[PDB]
Design a protein around this motif. Structure first.
Motif, PDB file in Angstrom:
ATOM      1  N   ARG A 369      32.886 -57.451   2.070  1.00  0.00           N
ATOM      2  CA  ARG A 369      33.059 -56.040   1.830  1.00  0.00           C
ATOM      3  C   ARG A 369      32.747 -55.176   3.053  1.00  0.00           C
ATOM      4  O   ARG A 369      33.542 -54.294   3.443  1.00  0.00           O
ATOM      5  CB  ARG A 369      32.213 -55.569   0.644  1.00  0.00           C
ATOM      6  N   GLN A 370      31.580 -55.392   3.648  1.00  0.00           N
ATOM      7  CA  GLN A 370      31.182 -54.513   4.737  1.00  0.00           C
ATOM      8  C   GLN A 370      32.018 -54.679   5.992  1.00  0.00           C
ATOM      9  O   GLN A 370      32.312 -53.689   6.689  1.00  0.00           O
ATOM     10  CB  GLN A 370      29.685 -54.630   5.043  1.00  0.00           C
ATOM     11  N   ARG A 371      32.402 -55.914   6.269  1.00  0.00           N
ATOM     12  CA  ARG A 371      33.172 -56.197   7.475  1.00  0.00           C
ATOM     13  C   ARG A 371      34.629 -55.746   7.346  1.00  0.00           C
ATOM     14  O   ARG A 371      35.252 -55.426   8.351  1.00  0.00           O
ATOM     15  CB  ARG A 371      33.071 -57.680   7.837  1.00  0.00           C
ATOM     16  N   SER A 372      35.148 -55.707   6.124  1.00  0.00           N
ATOM     17  CA  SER A 372      36.509 -55.173   5.897  1.00  0.00           C
ATOM     18  C   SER A 372      36.548 -53.666   5.583  1.00  0.00           C
ATOM     19  O   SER A 372      37.626 -53.067   5.595  1.00  0.00           O
ATOM     20  CB  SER A 372      37.207 -55.939   4.771  1.00  0.00           C
ATOM     21  N   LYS A 373      35.389 -53.066   5.326  1.00  0.00           N
ATOM     22  CA  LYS A 373      35.275 -51.657   4.893  1.00  0.00           C
ATOM     23  C   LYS A 373      36.027 -51.380   3.591  1.00  0.00           C
ATOM     24  O   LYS A 373      36.541 -50.289   3.369  1.00  0.00           O
ATOM     25  CB  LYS A 373      35.671 -50.696   6.035  1.00  0.00           C
ATOM     26  N   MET A 374      36.033 -52.367   2.698  1.00  0.00           N
ATOM     27  CA  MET A 374      36.843 -52.279   1.490  1.00  0.00           C
ATOM     28  C   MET A 374      36.115 -51.460   0.434  1.00  0.00           C
ATOM     29  O   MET A 374      34.985 -51.747   0.076  1.00  0.00           O
ATOM     30  CB  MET A 374      37.129 -53.697   0.974  1.00  0.00           C
ATOM     31  N   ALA A 375      36.762 -50.430  -0.077  1.00  0.00           N
ATOM     32  CA  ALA A 375      36.173 -49.659  -1.176  1.00  0.00           C
ATOM     33  C   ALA A 375      36.077 -50.539  -2.421  1.00  0.00           C
ATOM     34  O   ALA A 375      36.941 -51.397  -2.630  1.00  0.00           O
ATOM     35  CB  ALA A 375      37.043 -48.455  -1.460  1.00  0.00           C
ATOM     36  N   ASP A 376      35.041 -50.331  -3.230  1.00  0.00           N
ATOM     37  CA  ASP A 376      34.936 -51.034  -4.494  1.00  0.00           C
ATOM     38  C   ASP A 376      35.726 -50.289  -5.556  1.00  0.00           C
ATOM     39  O   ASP A 376      36.234 -49.185  -5.307  1.00  0.00           O
ATOM     40  CB  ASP A 376      33.479 -51.220  -4.915  1.00  0.00           C
ATOM     41  N   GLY A 377      35.840 -50.903  -6.727  1.00  0.00           N
ATOM     42  CA  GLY A 377      36.570 -50.319  -7.829  1.00  0.00           C
ATOM     43  C   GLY A 377      37.991 -50.834  -7.889  1.00  0.00           C
ATOM     44  O   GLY A 377      38.411 -51.703  -7.094  1.00  0.00           O
ATOM     45  N   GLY A 378      38.708 -50.305  -8.867  1.00  0.00           N
ATOM     46  CA  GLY A 378      40.082 -50.688  -9.120  1.00  0.00           C
ATOM     47  C   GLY A 378      40.167 -51.944  -9.961  1.00  0.00           C
ATOM     48  O   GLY A 378      39.173 -52.462 -10.434  1.00  0.00           O
ATOM     49  N   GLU A 379      41.383 -52.441 -10.119  1.00  0.00           N
ATOM     50  CA  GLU A 379      41.646 -53.544 -11.022  1.00  0.00           C
ATOM     51  C   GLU A 379      41.893 -54.865 -10.299  1.00  0.00           C
ATOM     52  O   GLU A 379      42.016 -55.891 -10.942  1.00  0.00           O
ATOM     53  CB  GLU A 379      42.868 -53.208 -11.889  1.00  0.00           C
ATOM     54  N   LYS A 380      41.968 -54.834  -8.974  1.00  0.00           N
ATOM     55  CA  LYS A 380      42.285 -56.027  -8.191  1.00  0.00           C
ATOM     56  C   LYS A 380      41.016 -56.714  -7.703  1.00  0.00           C
ATOM     57  O   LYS A 380      39.958 -56.086  -7.591  1.00  0.00           O
ATOM     58  CB  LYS A 380      43.134 -55.656  -6.963  1.00  0.00           C
ATOM     59  N   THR A 381      41.140 -57.986  -7.351  1.00  0.00           N
ATOM     60  CA  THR A 381      40.044 -58.762  -6.783  1.00  0.00           C
ATOM     61  C   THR A 381      40.513 -59.442  -5.505  1.00  0.00           C
ATOM     62  O   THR A 381      41.605 -60.017  -5.475  1.00  0.00           O
ATOM     63  CB  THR A 381      39.573 -59.828  -7.771  1.00  0.00           C
ATOM     64  N   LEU A 382      39.674 -59.381  -4.456  1.00  0.00           N
ATOM     65  CA  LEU A 382      39.886 -60.198  -3.256  1.00  0.00           C
ATOM     66  C   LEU A 382      38.941 -61.378  -3.375  1.00  0.00           C
ATOM     67  O   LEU A 382      37.742 -61.181  -3.602  1.00  0.00           O
ATOM     68  CB  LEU A 382      39.605 -59.390  -1.992  1.00  0.00           C
ATOM     69  N   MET A 383      39.484 -62.589  -3.264  1.00  0.00           N
ATOM     70  CA  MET A 383      38.720 -63.822  -3.485  1.00  0.00           C
ATOM     71  C   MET A 383      38.714 -64.662  -2.209  1.00  0.00           C
ATOM     72  O   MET A 383      39.767 -65.099  -1.719  1.00  0.00           O
ATOM     73  CB  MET A 383      39.336 -64.642  -4.655  1.00  0.00           C
ATOM     74  N   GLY A 384      37.545 -64.925  -1.660  1.00  0.00           N
ATOM     75  CA  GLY A 384      37.491 -65.817  -0.480  1.00  0.00           C
ATOM     76  C   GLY A 384      37.259 -67.236  -0.976  1.00  0.00           C
ATOM     77  O   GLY A 384      36.368 -67.457  -1.773  1.00  0.00           O
ATOM     78  N   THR A 385      38.041 -68.188  -0.484  1.00  0.00           N
ATOM     79  CA  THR A 385      37.928 -69.567  -0.943  1.00  0.00           C
ATOM     80  C   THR A 385      38.517 -70.505   0.101  1.00  0.00           C
ATOM     81  O   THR A 385      38.936 -70.043   1.176  1.00  0.00           O
ATOM     82  CB  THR A 385      38.561 -69.733  -2.359  1.00  0.00           C
ATOM     83  N   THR A 386      38.521 -71.800  -0.233  1.00  0.00           N
ATOM     84  CA  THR A 386      38.957 -72.866   0.665  1.00  0.00           C
ATOM     85  C   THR A 386      39.905 -73.773  -0.088  1.00  0.00           C
ATOM     86  O   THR A 386      39.592 -74.224  -1.222  1.00  0.00           O
ATOM     87  CB  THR A 386      37.757 -73.683   1.148  1.00  0.00           C
ATOM     88  N   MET A 387      41.061 -74.053   0.538  1.00  0.00           N
ATOM     89  CA  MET A 387      42.077 -74.924  -0.047  1.00  0.00           C
ATOM     90  C   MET A 387      41.722 -76.394   0.268  1.00  0.00           C
ATOM     91  O   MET A 387      40.791 -76.654   1.027  1.00  0.00           O
ATOM     92  CB  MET A 387      43.485 -74.578   0.513  1.00  0.00           C
ATOM     93  N   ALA A 388      42.487 -77.336  -0.292  1.00  0.00           N
ATOM     94  CA  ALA A 388      42.103 -78.743  -0.278  1.00  0.00           C
ATOM     95  C   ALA A 388      42.011 -79.313   1.132  1.00  0.00           C
ATOM     96  O   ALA A 388      41.237 -80.242   1.368  1.00  0.00           O
ATOM     97  CB  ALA A 388      43.090 -79.559  -1.106  1.00  0.00           C
TER      98      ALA A 388
END
Length: 401
Positions: A369-388
């Motif tokens: 959040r802090q490094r992207s300056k992303m506002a909170d709220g809304g209906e969407k989600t940003l998900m950090g993860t790792t593929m196989a």
């Protein structure tokens, strides 16, 4: 100051009569409370808001007396206490060895006809002796005892209850060896004199440690409420055949605002299954609830439901077809973004605001959040993860319903 029944009645009458005074006003202000009782009345008033939040059904009952702030913050919540009632056949006998504020005992007595409550601490027991009869339905028979249950073993054995309930205290890690009272000698001595023992354990206890350490376990339940694991419940019984630990049924359940169905599996099943891990994301994305995670049904969920898992350490799933009854959150995939430090400042371009989650990712959600300056709220989600294949990605997700 310890109070008898007459004094508890007065204190609760004064707490109600003078309810609109602050605790300091009670103490140095205008009322008919004798000096020696003002602290007790102030104490009841002080903690009523916190009682109302936690146990709103109690906060609405006249004459209930809370023995301490300590006893209030240690108690079961309303929702998990009532789930326990499902273990207890209607009209049976119960003993609660560890007592406390009595909300678990009350939940047991919603079903049982006769009960013995035992509590080490005199002060706590005095309050329960007052409160319990105000909370029980009609036609219930209880014995409310002060002291350590090890002083009442002949009475317990003679009673021969259908169920013995225990909620031990902790004497870095929380191990089964640290339980007070110790569950192993307890079970050796008491299993012959009940149908089952039901033990409520901390969510910090290791499942496998528990299953390796306790004899005669028949089922283990991982119980979540309010978005988090609240307790483990283990039932033991000499009444039924011994089950090896890897075959003990584990129930993962996430209690919600309404009937819900457990995910039941065994460690043997979890270990025996093998699944595909996917390098690529599909249309639907699935995030398992906290009870599933704690129970460790990582592979079993994918196998049971025909889903692909992202990575052994990424506890997320994906599929092209909609699973409508997924045990956790279900999302529709909108974008998949290969992760690198340089993409962080670009994320405000993709969505105006979002919730942020991580499942196997080098940043925490707050760092993302802090490094992207992303506002909170809304209906969407940003998900950090790792593929196989180990590639780190960000997923832009919306809720599936």
């Amino acid at each position: 100051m310890l109070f008898d029944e007459k004094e508890i009645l007065a204190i609760t009458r004064w707490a109600k009569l003078y309810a609109n005074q602050s605790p300091d006003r009670i103490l140095l202000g205008s009322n008919d409370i004798p000096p020696e009782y003002r602290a007790a009345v102030a104490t009841q008033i002080e903690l009523w808001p916190r009682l109302r939040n936690k146990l709103p059904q109690w906060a609405g009952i006249s004459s209930l007396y809370i023995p301490s702030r300590l006893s209030l913050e240690q108690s079961s919540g309303a929702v998990t206490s009532s789930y326990k009632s499902r273990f207890i056949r209607e009209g049976t006998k119960v003993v609660d060895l560890t007592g406390g504020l009595g909300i678990d005992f009350i939940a047991l007595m919603s079903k049982a006809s006769q009960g013995i409550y035992i509590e080490r601490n005199d002060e706590t027991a005095v309050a329960a002796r007052h409160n319990i009869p105000l909370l029980l339905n009609e036609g219930k028979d209880v014995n409310i005892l002060t002291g350590d249950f090890k002083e009442y073993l002949p009475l317990i054995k003679t009673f021969h209850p259908d169920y013995i309930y225990v909620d031990p205290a902790r004497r870095r890690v929380y191990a089964i060896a640290d339980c007070e009272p110790d569950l192993i000698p307890l079970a050796t001595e008491l299993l012959p004199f009940c149908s089952s023992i039901l033990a409520k354990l901390s969510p910090m206890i290791d499942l496998w440690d528990t299953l390796q350490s306790l004899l005669h376990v028949q089922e283990l339940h991982v119980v979540a409420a309010h978005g988090e694991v609240k307790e483990l419940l283990v039932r033991m019984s000499l009444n039924e055949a011994t089950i090896p630990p890897e075959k003990v049924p584990i129930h993962a359940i996430n209690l919600l605002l309404e009937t819900v169905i457990p995910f039941i599996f065994t460690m043997e099943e979890e270990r025996s299954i093998s699944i595909p891990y996917t390098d690529s994301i599909d249309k639907y994305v699935y995030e398992p609830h906290t009870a599933l995670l704690k129970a460790g049904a990582f592979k079993t969920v994918a196998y049971r439901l025909g889903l692909r898992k992202l990575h052994p350490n990424s506890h997320l799933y994906t599929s092209e077809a909609y699973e409508s009854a997924f045990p956790g959150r279900t999302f529709v995939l909108e974008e998949i973004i290969p992760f690198s430090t340089s993409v962080l400042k670009q994320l405000r371009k993709v969505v105006p605001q979002a919730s942020i989650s991580c499942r196997n990712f080098p940043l925490s959600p707050i760092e993302l959040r802090q490094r992207s300056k992303m506002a909170d709220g809304g209906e969407k989600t940003l998900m950090g993860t790792t593929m196989a294949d180990g590639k780190k990605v960000l997923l832009l997700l919306r809720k599936a319903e």
